[PDB]
């Protein structure tokens, strides 16, 4: 099930084709936070599937200090906390022997500031999509089994166009009004 | 385990090779999809193991 | 139904599962509880008002 | 059961019509708290179905503050909780860069502050009164099976009453001493 759409839509809708797991072959034309600890880290990345980087007395930089009530919430054991305390306590001797630090203690704040949203409850297929690939190459015209197409245009969209038409047995849709990334995921989705 | 791995079920194109191998007891003969097949279906193994 | 029975929990709770691959073969609870008779069958009205 | 009654009556009675649930049809003749955040207001409001504002950093008004206490009386989660600290210690900084919080933590403070009583305990039936309506008007006198009467006067009641009392089969009921809306109140209790 691979896809040809303009570029300007897969431009657009990147990050839901990560989200997706779809991956992207397309053509161009022409400061963060850290955690005390990797055991936190490795455990908020288990949990939510985003990456946290390590804080290694790089520079002056801002610091999440997980609380007590995200300790439980995420299950993280004794020694996690000892250990978080102990590079607390290390910092407070550091910045005394003359760095922002934030202790973030509701789940909603640590989703708003930085990382994914949680999982939904749903049962888990085996894949997300049937899709494989969206390109916008005439390199793999005959790789693709259907086109999407779209009023918006790319210097390079006429001629793929008509050499996917040539295709003896191909799926072809086409999107009028609304909103042309809506009516792709749809049809991903659906497709 | 309690698995019938092995049958045979029509002459094949080569005479020599009329075994049919089935891995968990899942049938060959009928498509499947990625995105809804396997939810809700277990074999002996993995529910004993379970 | 299925879904809201096996995957809604504030905390752990006791669930079985059956042989068949179809939705509602599980018993749920400290006791055993079959939800096989909430599966739809118009033959015999089960699980409804009739 | 549709009801005639003197509009004063109505106009007496209406919180406790409202609070039974008897739609009113009459004609005449001539500060608040905030919770910090809306799950707890939420909450709160399906406990006691009193409907509750919440604060949107409008002006230096007055705030409420459900404390561990209450907090607990109604199950709220920790989720809750750490929301409504993290407002508060934002509020704590908002006031601190140079509005009045009250610190709530009995039930019966709440109740005689604002909001409605608690509920009994007795089995819910399908519907509090057997009457929908209770209307002052003529242009619904046709509409009436039953009126009540009272030495209050209105300028439209003499000629209602004439055009009520001309039906073949209407309940008539008088009061003549007592309290006019307590024997109001039993006869739509007891209708």
Known sequence: ?191 | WATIDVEYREPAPYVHAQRYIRYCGIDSRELINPTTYGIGMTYHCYNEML | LNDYLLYMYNTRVQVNYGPTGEPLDFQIGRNQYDCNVFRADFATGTGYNG
Do not use: C
């Open chain 1, 1 to 191: 099930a691979m896809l040809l759409a303009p570029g300007d839509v897969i431009k657009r809708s990147s990050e839901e084709l990560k989200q997706r797991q779809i991956q992207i072959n397309l053509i161009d034309w022409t400061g963060r936070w850290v955690v005390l600890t990797e055991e936190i880290a490795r455990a908020i990345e288990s949990k939510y599937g985003t990456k946290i980087d390590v804080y290694r007395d790089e520079v002056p930089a801002q610091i999440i200090e997980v609380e007590r009530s995200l300790q439980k919430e995420l299950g993280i054991s004794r020694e996690g906390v000892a250990e978080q305390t102990e590079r607390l306590r290390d910092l407070r001797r550091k910045e005394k022997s003359g760095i922002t630090i934030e202790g973030v203690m509701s789940q909603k704040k640590l989703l708003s500031m930085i990382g994914g949203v949680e999982r939904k409850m749903a049962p888990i297929g085996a894949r997300e999509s049937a899709v494989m690939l969206v390109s916008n190459s005439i390199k793999d015209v005959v790789r693709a089994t259907a086109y999407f197409t779209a009023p918006t245009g790319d210097p390079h969209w006429k001629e793929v166009a008509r050499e996917a038409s040539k295709k003896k047995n191909i799926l072809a849709y086409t999107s009028t009004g609304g909103d042309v990334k809506t009516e792709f995921l749809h049809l991903i989705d659906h497709l």
